[PDB]
Symmetry: C2
Subunit: 137 residues, 2 copies
């Protein structure tokens, strides 16, 4: 068995490296995936904001979010990683540049993860959706 | 007392709803952060740094929502040392406009000597903003 913290550290490494197939390898086949965003299509400006429940869906998310950002001006700064049993919360800030508009933005985020059998089963993002939306609108 | 005991008491007092008694749990100086742009359509969205400012924040959130159509749920309380994160969701109706919204939130707290020294809220700012705009 691998600790929750080690599993979370590996996920954060793979997310920062960016490859969607390699990130999704860390998720269970079925994933509880939630984003602190309203439902709908948001006039098309944030296409990765959709409902997901599968490893294949997770791979699609990380593909889309990469395609919509300038890779060399985008990153997530992690301030702390809290771990309690099988759960963890990653606290940080998105420092990204939106591809279509060129606007840089900062968005605080908390990422709540659950791990079982070394795989991520839950990935719930709480982030400044207003700031992200404004950067792409 | 423990971090979790302090957090559990804060949840009790938030549910009781008295802003003054909620603020009693905070240090005189507080690290306050909200997952909102640094740009008053939503009346409580502003910076704070003191216990008195916390009391006013909880007074404003009560006043500006339609109480009989509003509810809060706590899904999980994670605790790691001096830090804790409360995960949940608000299902409220904006007072000025009557429009309902739902806003998942993660509340990051730090406790030192039984007082809350840090209160960092991560929530669906877009959903709240739309309800009040």
């Amino acid at each position: 068995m691998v600790s929750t913290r080690e599993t979370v550290n590996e996920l954060l490494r793979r997310i920062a490296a960016g490859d969607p197939g390699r990130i999704a390898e860390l998720y269970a086949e079925e994933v509880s995936w939630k984003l602190s965003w309203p439902a709908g299509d948001h006039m098309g400006v944030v296409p990765w904001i959709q409902q997901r429940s599968t490893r294949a869906g997770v791979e699609e998310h990380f593909r889309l979010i990469a395609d919509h950002h300038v890779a060399k001006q985008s990153s997530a700064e992690v301030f702390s990683v809290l771990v309690d049993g099988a759960d963890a919360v990653v606290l940080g800030e998105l420092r990204n540049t939106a591809g279509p508009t060129g606007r840089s933005y900062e968005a605080p985020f908390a990422l709540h993860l659950t791990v079982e059998n070394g795989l991520v089963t839950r990935h719930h993002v709480y982030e400044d959706s207003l700031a992200v939306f404004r950067a792409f609108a």
